């Protein structure tokens, strides 16, 4: 009903990006982890990878994390839901360069976090402000 | 035609936050600083203050940064555009971050765009 909770591992769909492996956390500054922007709701996540990035992301753009094997399937539904064939084709981009390297880092870290207890991976990966 | 460029100080309005001082910058991973989310244009900023946060923000949610003084004014016209939700005290660790990032923003407004691109951009 509240689909996610702090510590839940999620994929984030961010514009301009492939699906990115994440963890739900509380905002260091706001102290919440979900809010109403006034009734399609956000969750605050951390992005995995050696970049310590964080964001508030819409429920509509999160998907609970099951493993790297989800990935290909996730991108199809992103395409299954695009209007024209100018948005459904806009996803055929190769993940290369620094972006792939960060992404791989993120995916490896997410599986590292997936095999953990929630209260474990909470205390190991949550950024300390 | 493009309302900002790499090195421009702007205020950004992120929901649930008070207006934040930022610099327009190139996304290190995407290698762009502006894009169409497709007819709502975004720019990529980095939020001043010691936590190096960066985001794509909408053009509708950015104002150019002349100095701390506009804060009041900016907020009042935001609250007139919903409403009572922005009537909260900026306190604690958020006020500390905010005040820190404002300070860095005023400092970069004296420099040339070259000066501030060197000093203030993030090494990624
Ligand atoms: Se979602 C996906 C599946 C297969 C191949 C590529 C993608 C993808 O999102 N690629 C991509 C590459 C680069 C950038 N900047 C965004 C997206
Ligand atoms: Se924008 C503003 C002007 C005057 C006083 C306060 C504000 C403000 O936004 N405060 C605020 C406090 C806490 C949070 N989470 C958001 C905003």
UniProtKB/Swiss-Prot annotation, chain B:
Widely expressed. Predominantly expressed in thymus and testis. It is found in: Nucleus; Chromosome. Residues 6-67 form the PWWP domain. It is linked to Rauch-Steindl syndrome: An autosomal dominant disorder characterized by poor pre- and postnatal growth, facial dysmorphism, and variable developmental delay with delayed motor and speech acquisition and impaired intellectual. Other features may include hypotonia and behavioral abnormalities. Interacts with HDAC1. Interacts (via PHD-type zinc fingers 1, 2 and 3) with SALL1. Interacts (via PHD-type 1, 2 and 3) with SALL4. Interacts with NANOG. Interacts with OGT. Interacts (via HMG box) with NKX2-5. Histone methyltransferase which specifically dimethylates nucleosomal histone H3 at 'Lys-36' (H3K36me2). Also monomethylates nucleosomal histone H3 at 'Lys-36' (H3K36me) in vitro. Does not trimethylate nucleosomal histone H3 at 'Lys-36' (H3K36me3). However, specifically trimethylates histone H3 at 'Lys-36' (H3K36me3) at euchromatic regions in embryonic stem (ES) cells. By methylating histone H3 at 'Lys-36', involved in the regulation of gene transcription during various biological processes. Belongs to the class V-like SAM-binding methyltransferase superfamily. Histone-lysine methyltransferase family. SET2 subfamily. This is Histone-lysine N-methyltransferase NSD2. The lineage of its organism: Eukaryota, Metazoa, Chordata, Craniata, Vertebrata. The chain holds residues 217 to 348 of 1365 of the full protein.
């Amino acid at each position: 009903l509240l689909k996610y909770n702090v510590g839940d591992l999620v994929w984030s769909k961010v514009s301009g990006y492939p699906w990115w492996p994440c963890m739900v956390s509380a905002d260091p500054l706001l102290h919440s982890y979900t809010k109403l922007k006034k009734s399609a709701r956000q969750y605050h996540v951390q992005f995995f990878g050696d970049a310590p990035e964080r964001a508030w992301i819409f429920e509509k753009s999160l998907v609970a994390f099951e493993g790297e094997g989800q990935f290909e399937k996730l991108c199809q539904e992103s395409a299954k839901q695009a209007p024209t064939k100018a948005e459904k084709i806009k996803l055929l981009k190769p993940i290369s360069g620094k972006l792939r390297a960060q992404w791989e880092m993120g995916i490896v870290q997410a599986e590292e976090a997936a095999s953990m207890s929630v209260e474990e991976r909470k205390a190991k990966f949550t950024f300390l402000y």
